[PDB]
Amino acid sequence: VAGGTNKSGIVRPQEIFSAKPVEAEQSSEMLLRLKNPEVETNKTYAQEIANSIELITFERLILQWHLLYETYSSTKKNVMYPDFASDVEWMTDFLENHPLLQPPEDIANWCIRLELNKTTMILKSISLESIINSLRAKHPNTYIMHSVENTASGIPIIIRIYLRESAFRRSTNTRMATDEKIAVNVVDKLLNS
């Protein structure tokens, strides 16, 4: 009866006879056969392909997120939230460790701070560079900074995503959307990546 596999009562028969759309199906499944008859013999290859296809959104790797009204300039001291002013220690390290990833000239005054869940990053076996590359590829109108991949508990991994001004230039003729509304909408898109 669990959500996603609900086969209790008369529920699957109702899904068939009522011609319900795919969105209303509570027990949908699918059987996939490996392209290689040779690979299909060995279970480790079948197991790593099965774990390869499992929707891990960016949202489920997150413990908490904060939307901050901040801009990043490397030289000029811009104002920062007092709770996360300690983040400046790993800002400097990121800039000297990524000389090719310098902050752009069109960073808007909107920042998204992220605190990754380390238990899920271990249980799902997801590296930090896998997250960063996935986010940079899908979201080009943002600038992304992060701390180092730490192996010691108590020191979190912080993902900080700055919005470029091009995010608001996408569709601003639709004036019924304040900059806070686009910035929040950007949060929803990035989380569901």
Partner: protein, 48 residues
């Protein structure tokens, strides 16, 4: 009980796609099934 001892020591690690609660329940449901040899004493007490 041996599953509980693993849990108390933090030895239970779930596979990808399962939480520790779901994996522990999967182990406990499997460990508490009667074996096929349960009919050895049942059949030794009866005359067919």
């Amino acid at each position: 009980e041996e599953i509980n001892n693993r849990l108390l020591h933090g030895d239970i690690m779930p596979p990808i796609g399962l939480t520790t609660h779901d994996f522990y329940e999967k182990l406990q449901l499997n460990a508490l099934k009667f074996p096929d040899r349960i009919l050895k004493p049942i059949m030794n007490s009866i005359n067919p």
